[PDB]
């Protein structure tokens, strides 16, 4: 039994926590949908 339940509206929130960095990465995407790093 896979089922869904509403959890909220899709909205931007002005007072959201802010975190995370912004890496620039070379990647490849294979037939299975898997990303891998490339050098």
């Amino acid at each position: 039994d896979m089922y869904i339940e509403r959890a909220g509206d899709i909205t931007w929130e002005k007072d959201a926590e802010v975190t995370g960095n912004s890496p620039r990465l070379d990647v490849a995407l294979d037939e299975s949908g898997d990303f891998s790093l490339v050098e």
Partner: protein, 148 residues
């Protein structure tokens, strides 16, 4: 059928993912449901389009989300974590550089059951879904968007 963000549950119950209802179509990542039918109350949602390489699937109609990261602005992950209320996390995306062009990427590492959570631009439009990515031990998610 109401527009919004939804938990994807399986049966005790476990949250396996998240998705977006928009314009009567439910959008999530292929690896969350593997294309299985979904229950919604007394109703049933059947898969309509899916693609393993994009890791995306839509139910009840074709993929509707088409906004894209602008490459410059901060975005918000509308995370729906297992056992917790929906919560916005703001971030500046990095970039996946691929031979077919650049994809925005968010360096946020949340539980597997948040896969399918929408990433939003400042206008509130869904620019992609969270949960297919790479490890650099820190996970980085592509901002995965389909085609409308």
């Amino acid at each position: 059928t109401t527009d919004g963000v939804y938990r994807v549950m399986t049966r005790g119950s476990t949250q396996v993912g998240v998705g977006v209802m928009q314009e009567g179509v439910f959008h999530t990542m292929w690896h969350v449901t593997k294309g299985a039918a979904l229950r919604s109350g007394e109703g049933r949602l059947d898969p309509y389009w899916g693609d393993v390489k994009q890791d995306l699937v839509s139910y009840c109609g074709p993929w509707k989300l088409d906004a894209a990261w602008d490459g410059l602005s901060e975005v918000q992950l509308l995370a729906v974590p297992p056992g917790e209320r929906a919560k916005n996390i703001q971030t500046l995306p990095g970039i996946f550089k691929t031979k077919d062009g650049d994809i925005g990427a968010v360096a946020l590492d949340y539980p597997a059951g948040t896969s399918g959570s929408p990433i939003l631009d400042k206008s509130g439009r869904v620019i992609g879904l969270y949960g297919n990515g790479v490890v650099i031990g820190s996970y980085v998610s592509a901002i995965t968007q389909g085609k409308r």
